[PDB]
Design a protein around this ligand. Structure first.
Ligand SMILES: CCCN(CCC)CCc1ccc(OC)c(OCCc2ccccc2)c1
Ligand SMILES: CCCN(CCC)CCc1ccc(OC)c(OCCc2ccccc2)c1
Ligand SMILES: CCCN(CCC)CCc1ccc(OC)c(OCCc2ccccc2)c1
Lengths: 220, 212, 220
C-alpha cells in the first residue's frame, strides 16, 4: 500500500499552505464579524427621551442610562471633562463618553451659538438635539433646514454642509467610521487659529482615556 | 556657450514684449454697470429664478463667455473666517463673474485683493465695516457695493443673502485668500479641487472662444 | 590645589548657573514695576462708559495722557487696525505697550464670535458700549456684560467670546505680552493673509516699545 503514504516534508509544507489560506480567509471575516457597541439609531432614540428636560439633568440621566445599558464602555465620572472644540470656523464644547477606533459618542454644544463648515469625514455622524436649534445648509443647494430638540441630523460620509447653532444648543453625537481622520479635522482651527495647545492636550487625553477603557474592557 | 545666454535672454525679451503689448491692448468682455443693471433688474425675483434669468441674459449678451450648464456648479467657499457659496459664470486672468451668497449668513474678513470687486445684491443684506471707521453701512437688494483694490473691510451677510459679483484685476491673486480657510480651517480638499476645476473650465472656455 | 572631573565640574557649573539664574530671576521679579495698577484702567474707563464711544475714547485718551505722560502713544501714532484671531474679527487702537503691559481700545461695529485665546497674561476688558457675552470653560451657561462692567480673563483661562453690534471697550493686559501677540495674529496669517494688517499691528507694537524705551531711558 505505497500509494496511501504521504511524505513528511510535503505534509509540513502543505499544512503551512493550509494555515496560510485559513488565516488569510478568517482575517477577512473580521470585517464581516464587525460589532458596533451601540446600534445606529439607539443613541438617537435614547437621547430623544431626555430632550424634554434641561440639558444638565438630561445629560446626567442619559449618562446613567448609557452606563447601565453598556457597562464598561462609558468613561467614569473621574474622566468626564468638558473641553473646547474649534474647527472649520466654528467653536463649541464636547464631553467624550465613549471613544474607539470605529465609534465615538460625545455630548456637544454651545451656549453662544456658532457658524461654519461641517467638514468632510470618512464617517457617518448623527446629532440628536437635546436643546436649541440646528441649521444645516447642504452643498449645492441655496436653502437650509432647521432642526429642533428631539430631532436627529444625519451627516453621511464625504458630505459637506454649512452648520449654524443658535444660543444654548446641546446634543448627543454618535460617529461611525475612521474616527482618527475626523479627529484630524476637529483640531485644525485649534492649531492654526486659536493656538490652544492645552485644549489639544485635553482632547487627545480624552481620546486616550476612551481607548484605554475600550482595551481594558476587551481584556477583562 | 556664453552667447547661449544672450540668445536665451533675447528670445525672453521678445516674448515679454509680446506679452506686454497683449496685456496692454486687451479689452474687457463685461462692464461694471452692465452686470450691476442686469442683477438689479432681477432683484425682485426669487433668487433661483433671478440667477436663471441673469445666466440666460449673460449668455445671449456675450456668447462664448459663459460656461454651459454642464459646467455650472455651486461650490462652498471658506475664506477670511466666513463661509459662503459661489457659482462661476465667467473667469479669465483679468475678469470674473459669479453668483455668491449664503443661506445661513456669515461674518468675516472681506479680503485684501489686487482687484476691484462689485457686488449687486439680489436678496438679503450686506453689512460692510470699512477700515479705520467705527460704524458700518448696510446694502439691500438692488444696491451695489464696490470693494476697491488694497482695501480691507469686515463683512456680514444676513441669513439668505445672494448677490452677483463682477471682479476685475489680477484674478489669480484672490485665489490665495479665497482658499486659505479651505487649507487651514476646513481641510476640504474636495472643495479645493472643485474650485480649481471651475477656474480651469472658465479659462478653457475663454481660450477656445478666443481661438475659435 | 586639585583637579575636578569632566563630569564633576560639569555638574558643578550646572549648579552654579542654576543658582545664578534662579537668584537673578528673583531679583528681576523684585524690581518689576508696572505703569498702571491692576484696576486703574478699569476704574478710569468706567467713568466714560455710557457716552458715545468716540467721545469716551477721546476723553479717556486725554485723561490717560494726563495721568501717565510718556506712556501713551501720540495722535500721529494712533491708528485703528483690524484684528483677526480665534475665528473672530474686530479692530484695535493701541495706546500703550511694553513687554509686560499693554492698553488698547477695542471693538467691532458688526459683532463677532470666537475663541478668547489662552495667554500667559491677565487681561481686563471694561465695556464702553455694546454687549459682551462670555462662556467660561467647563460650563454650559454664559454671562452677559453691559457698559460699565469689567470682564477679567486670568492667565491660562480660555473662554468663548461674543461681541454684539457696535461693541466698544477699553482693555488693559499684564503678563508676557509677546505670547499674546502670537495668538493675536493667527487668523491674519492662516485665514485672511492680510499682510498689511500684520505690518500695521507689528508697527504699533514697535511704536509702543519705542515710546516705553525712550521714557525709561530719558524720563518725562
Ligand atoms: C454638527 C456637529 C459637528 N460635527 C460635524 C457633523 C456635521 C462634528 C462634531 C465634532 C466635535 C468634536 C469632535 O472631536 C473633537 C469631533 O470629531 C470626533 C473625533 C474624536 C474626538 C475625541 C476623541 C476621539 C475622536 C466631531
Ligand atoms: C460680498 C463680499 C465678498 N467679496 C469681497 C469684495 C466685494 C469677495 C467674494 C468672493 C468669493 C469667492 C471668490 O472665489 C472663491 C472670490 O474671488 C473670485 C476670484 C476667483 C477665484 C478662483 C476662481 C474663479 C474666480 C470672491
Ligand atoms: C477676546 C477679547 C480680546 N482680548 C483677549 C482677552 C481674553 C484681547 C484683545 C486683543 C486684541 C488684539 C491684540 O493684538 C492685536 C491684543 O494684544 C495686544 C498686544 C499688542 C498687539 C499688537 C500691537 C501691540 C500690542 C489683544
Amino acid at each position: 500500500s505505497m500509494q496511501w503514504a504521504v511524505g513528511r516534508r510535503w505534509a509540513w509544507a502543505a499544512l503551512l499552505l493550509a494555515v496560510a489560506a485559513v488565516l488569510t480567509q478568517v482575517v477577512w471575516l473580521w470585517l464581516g464579524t464587525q460589532s458596533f457597541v451601540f446600534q445606529r439609531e439607539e443613541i438617537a432614540q435614547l437621547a430623544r427621551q431626555y430632550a424634554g428636560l434641561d440639558h444638565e439633568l438630561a445629560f446626567s440621566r442619559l449618562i446613567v442610562e448609557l452606563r447601565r445599558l453598556h457597562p464598561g464602555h462609558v468613561l467614569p465620572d473621574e474622566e468626564l471633562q468638558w473641553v473646547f472644540v474649534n474647527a472649520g470656523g466654528w467653536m463649541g464644547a464636547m464631553c467624550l463618553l465613549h471613544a474607539s477606533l470605529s465609534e465615538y459618542v460625545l455630548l456637544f454644544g454651545t451656549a453662544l451659538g456658532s457658524r461654519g463648515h461641517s467638514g468632510r469625514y470618512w464617517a457617518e455622524i448623527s446629532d440628536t438635539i437635546i436643546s436649541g436649534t440646528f441649521h444645516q445648509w447642504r452643498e449645492g443647494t441655496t436653502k437650509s433646514e432647521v432642526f429642533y430638540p428631539g430631532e436627529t441630523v444625519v451627516h453621511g460620509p464625504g458630505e459637506a454642509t454649512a452648520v449654524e447653532w443658535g444660543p444654548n444648543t446641546w446634543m448627543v453625537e454618535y460617529g461611525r467610521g475612521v474616527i482618527p481622520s475626523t479627529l484630524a479635522f476637529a483640531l485644525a482651527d485649534t492649531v492654526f487659529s486659536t493656538q490652544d495647545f492645552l485644549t489639544l492636550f485635553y482632547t487627545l487625553r480624552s481620546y486616550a482615556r476612551g481607548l484605554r477603557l475600550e482595551l481594558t474592557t476587551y481584556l477583562f
